[PDB]
Amino acid sequence: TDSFWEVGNYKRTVKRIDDGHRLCNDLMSCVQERAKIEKAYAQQLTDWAKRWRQLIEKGPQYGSLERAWGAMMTEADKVSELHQEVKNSLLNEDLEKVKNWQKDAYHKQIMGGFKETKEAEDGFRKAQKPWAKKMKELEAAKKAYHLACKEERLAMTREMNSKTEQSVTPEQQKKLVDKVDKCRQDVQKTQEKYEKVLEDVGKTTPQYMEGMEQVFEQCQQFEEKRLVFLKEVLLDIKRHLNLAENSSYMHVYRELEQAIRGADAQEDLRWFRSTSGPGMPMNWPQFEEW
Amino acid sequence: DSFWEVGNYKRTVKRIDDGHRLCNDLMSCVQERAKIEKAYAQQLTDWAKRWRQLIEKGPQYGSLERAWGAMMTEADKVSELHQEVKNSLLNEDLEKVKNWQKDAYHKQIMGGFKETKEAEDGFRKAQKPWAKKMKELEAAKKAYHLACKEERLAMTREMNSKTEQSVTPEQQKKLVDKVDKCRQDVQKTQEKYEKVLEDVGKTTPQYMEGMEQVFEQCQQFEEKRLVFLKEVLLDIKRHLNLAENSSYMHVYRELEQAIRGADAQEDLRWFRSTSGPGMPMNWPQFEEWNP
Amino acid sequence: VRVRALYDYDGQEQDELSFKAGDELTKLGEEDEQGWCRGRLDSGQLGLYPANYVEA
């Protein structure tokens, strides 16, 4: 069946070691693609900010409303910075951290594979060998034992519906019941052999179970180390993705509301009156000769 | 130069047209920002889709798979929020300017806006009298200045051939009568010039009073706009601000819970049970011969 | 383009190639939507493999 205890089925466990390395590559690339995404948003915000400052300042909008409107470009510049930081953390801290763990947990052979995958193969293989050899022995003896049963059986049937018929000549057929007899002794011999192997298997089962467990437990401890470390890395990442971990993000919009609240219509109005309105100076008529 | 100079009200008028243009620039600005927010949301959605799949069919299992997969849900939620920012920007903020623009500025078949034209007419009228009176003041100044110039020549004439031979007594007395008539010219046209001057000074208040009213109406209009602008800027800031949006806080509360719930021992027990020495097994036993 | 196997991979289909960690293949094309590539071992088994089982 698929039981772990059947010869060969330990490979699922060996395989989990190779899978762990791959999962590290997958995670690394995954965060890597997320940093591109964050970088792209920042840059677009940065361009808008640059674009609309130029477009606004170049007249005609004047006064504290230009100032209030332009405070928005600043918020685009500041949130842009925060998202660049998310990128810098993802790449310089989290990715490198996985990267270094990897190179220390998994060492590579010139052939191809990993030291660590190979080390669990050899442990499992070594622990199963006595067992496997006994299992080939058992199946053969069972075959041999059953082969005899079937035969001696034929010799049996080939007797009742046999002798009672024609040639029950003694000078011939007494040596016939001696075929059935010969089978008797044959089933016995093979039966005893089969039971012997079966007894061998019994007494070496504890050792088989002990040895396979020691290796399994080494594998679980290797995986636990991977799981504990990954958990800590996900946490590192969540912190970095979260612009609300601290309150710089909240200050951006507080700053923004203040700038808008500061702007006054009347000031913009009074200023126009002096530079373009009645407040402007004038040289009223007066007497003029040479 | 000065606004009081006949004609120089044309910059208060222009200001009305500028207001219109501004509304448009505001809508363009907020539209482009909307697009920026939608692009980002769009990329987070596809990253979530892509990695959810690779993960779920991949070889990771148990609660570490769940924790990692919960990162795809933060991406999806953060995406949903930037779509609301975008929808708010266009469907509320943008629209509101548009509607306001519609009721404030009305086109005319004669070309331009009704509002601009009314300012121009109001000034022109409030300036009509004063324009008429500066023309007269000008004309008068002219007469008087030609009057003095002619007197100068009249003298450079009289006593210019005097004791000189080419000129006689009967003829000298006419040159004196000449300069004598210029003297009167100068005086009568000086008095007129002086007169107009007085009326101009006496009516300058009425001119100012009148020009002020039209300007005050233009100021009032310009104000309505600035006020509405300040209003629309606070609207936009609200819609942009995820820092104190409760759903934004929830996404990362949820993410941290999912991660902190990953339990290595539970994953180990499960694997031991379904793939290792914990699995059932049928150990060999004596097997009798069938059929 | 050349490709080097990182992990052992068992064929779960007739069009799904099999190899050992360390063995080297030739990429016949680019990935698809799922992560699968068309490849070829030496004289000369042809089949699909997963791209994340390989490096440079």
Report the residue of B15, B17, B64 to disrupt the A interface, i.e. the one with the largest count of A CBs within 10 Å: B64
Give the span between the Cα atoms of B96 and B88, in whole angstroms.
11
Could you tell me which residues come within 8 angstroms of residue A71 by beta carbon, excluding any fewer than 6 positions away?
A255, A256, A259, A260
Residue A224, domain member (yes or no): yes
The answer to whether position B81 is within a domain reads yes
Question: Do the domain assignments include residue B291?
Answer: no
Residue A206, judged by CB atoms within 10 A of its CB (0-12, 13-18, 19+), counts as exposed
Is residue B276 within 8 Å of A216, Cβ to Cβ?
yes
Order of strands across the sheet that contains C54-55? C46-50, C36-40, C24-27, C2-5, C54-55
Residue B272 domain-assigned (yes or no): yes
Residues paired with residue C24 on neighbouring β-strands, in sequence order:
C4
Distance in angstroms between the alpha carbons of the first and the last residue of chain A: 126
Three-class DSSP category at A108:
strand
CA-based torsion, B200, B203, B209, B210: positive or negative: negative
Q: What gap in Å lies between CA B87 and CA B69, rounded to an integer?
A: 28
Count of Cβ atoms closer than 10 Å to residue A4 Cβ:
21
What chain A residue is nearest to B59 in terms of C-alpha separation? A19
φ/ψ (deg, to 5) at A278? -60, -30
What is the rounded CA–CA span in Å between residue B264 and residue B62? 9
Number of Cβ within 10 Å of residue B41's Cβ equals 21
A285 occurs within a structural domain: no
Query: Which tokens is C40 given?
Result: 């070829």
Q: Which tokens hold the place of B118?
A: 């009314």
In 3-state terms, chain A is what percent helix, strand and coil (to 5)? 80, 0, 20
Query: Is B4 part of any domain?
Result: yes
C44 prior amide bond cis, ω within 30: yes
Report the alpha-carbon distance of residue B217 to residue B219 in Å, rounded.
5
Give the contacts of B274 (CB within 8 A, at least 6 positions apart).
none
How many CB atoms within 10 Å of residue B5?
12
**What are the residues of chain A with a beta carbon less than 8 Å away from any beta carbon of chain C?**
15, 18-19, 21-22, 25-26, 109, 111-114, 117
Resolution (A): 2.6
- Picking from A269, A253, A279, A241, the residue whose alpha carbon sits closest to that of residue A89 is A241
Q: How many whole angstroms separate alpha carbon A280 and alpha carbon A272? A: 10
For residue A102, list chain C residues with Cβ-Cβ distance below 8 A.
Answer: none
Task: Give which of A253, A276, A256, A54 is closest to B230, Cα–Cα.
Answer: A256
Nearest to A235 by CA among B262, B50, B62, B247: B262
Closest of A112, A97, A57, A51 to residue A77, by C-alpha: A51
Q: If contacts are CB pairs under 8 Å, which of residues 250-269 in chain B contact chain A?
A: 252, 255-256, 259-260, 262, 264-265, 267-268
Whether residues A198 and B262 touch (CB distance < 8 A) is answered with no
CA B194 – CA B140 distance, rounded (Å): 9
Number of Cβ atoms within 10 Å of the Cβ of A40: 15
- Tell me the CA distances in angstroms from B156 to A228, B7, B61, B190, one per residue in order: 117, 42, 120, 21
H or E stretch at A78: helix A63-89
CA dist B156 and B166 (Å) reads 15
| C-alpha–C-alpha distance, residues B255 and B168, integer Å | 122
Q: Please, what are the domains in chain C?
A: 1-56 (2.30.30.40)
Question: Pick from A18, A26, A109: which is nearest to C8 by CB?
Answer: A18
Q: How many CB atoms lie within 10 A of CB A249?
A: 19
Instruction: Residue B286: name the closest of A149, A138, A188 by CA.
Output: A138
Note whether C35 contacts A: Cβ–Cβ < 8 A: no
Q: Where are the alpha helices (DSSP H) in A106-169?
A: 115-160
How far is Cα C50 from Cα C16, in angstroms, rounded to an integer?
9
Nearest to B4 among A51, A209, A280 (CB): A280
List chains adjacent to chain C, taking adjacency as at least 3 C-beta pairs closer than 8 Å. A
> Is residue A167 assigned to a domain?
yes
- Of the CA atoms within 13 Å of residue A144, those in its CB half-sphere come to 16
DSSP C42: S
Give the C-alpha separation, B182 to B176, whole Å.
10
Q: Centre a 10 Å sphere on the Cβ of residue B134 and count the other Cβ atoms it contains.
A: 15
Please check whether residue C29 touches A, CB under 8 A: no
Tell me the chain B residues in contact with residue A29 when contact means C-beta distances shorter than 8 Å: none
Is B233 within the bounds of a domain? Answer: yes
* Residue A288 phi, psi dihedral angles, 5° rounding: -145, 105
How far apart, in whole angstroms, are the C-alpha atoms of residue B233 and residue A74? 14
Distance, first Cα to last Cα, chain C: 9
CA distance C11 to A59: 69
In order of A29, A69, B149, B157, the CA distances from B152 in angstroms are 100, 66, 5, 8
HEC sequence for chain B: CCCCCCCCCHHHHHHHHHHHHHHHHHHHHHHHHHHHHHHHHHHHHHHHHHHHHHHHHCCCCHHHHHHHHCHHHHHHHHHHHHHHHHHHHHHHHHHHHHHHHHHHCCECCCCCEHHHHHHHHHHHHHCHHHHHHHHHHHHHHHHHHHHHHHHHHHHHHHCCCCCCCCCCHHHHHHHHHHHHHHHHHHHHHHHHHHHHHHHHHHHHHHHHHHHHHHHHHHHHHHHHHHHHHHHHHHHHHHHHCCCCCHHHHHHHHHHHHHHHHCCHHHHHHHHHHHHCCCCCCCCCCCCCCCC
User: How big is the A-C interface in CB pairs under 8 Å?
Assistant: 33
Cα B15 to Cα A279, B101, B222, B233: the distances in Å are 16, 15, 8, 21
Number of domains in chain A: 1
End-to-end CA distance of chain B: 123
Instruction: Print the domain residue range for A144.
Output: 1-279
φ, ψ dihedrals at B244, nearest 5°: -115, 30
The answer for residues whose C-beta is within 8 angstroms of residue C38's C-beta and 6 or more apart is: C27, C28, C29, C46, C48
Task: Measure the CA dihedral B201/B205/B210/B213, to 10°.
Answer: 150
User: At C43, is the secondary structure helix, strand, or coil?
Assistant: coil
Q: Which residues of B touch A3 (CB under 8 A)?
A: 279-282
State how far the Cα of B129 lies from the Cα of B202, in Å rounded to an integer. 13
Residue C38 φ/ψ region, left for φ over 0, alpha for ψ in the -120 to 50 degree band, beta for the rest:
beta
Task: Report d(CA B204, CA B97) in Å as an integer.
Answer: 42
Is residue B148 within 8 A of residue B166, CB to CB? The reply is no
Distance CA A8, CA C52 (A): 26
Q: Considering only CA atoms, which of B197, B42, B5, B78 is closest in space to residue A86? A: B78
Contact C6 A18 (CB under 8 A): yes
Q: List the CATH number of the domain containing A202.
A: 1.20.1270.60
Q: Are C35 and C52 in contact (CB under 8 A)?
A: yes
DSSP letters for A244-265: TSSSHHHHHHHHHHHHHHH--H
Q: Tell me which chain A residues have a C-beta less than 8 angstroms from the C-beta of B229.
A: 65, 69
Q: Are C45 and C1 in contact (CB under 8 A)?
A: no
Interface of A with B in 99-128 (CB under 8 A): none
- Closest alpha carbon within chain C to A112: C22
Site from A2, A29, A30 to mutate, B interface, most B CB atoms within 10 angstroms? A30
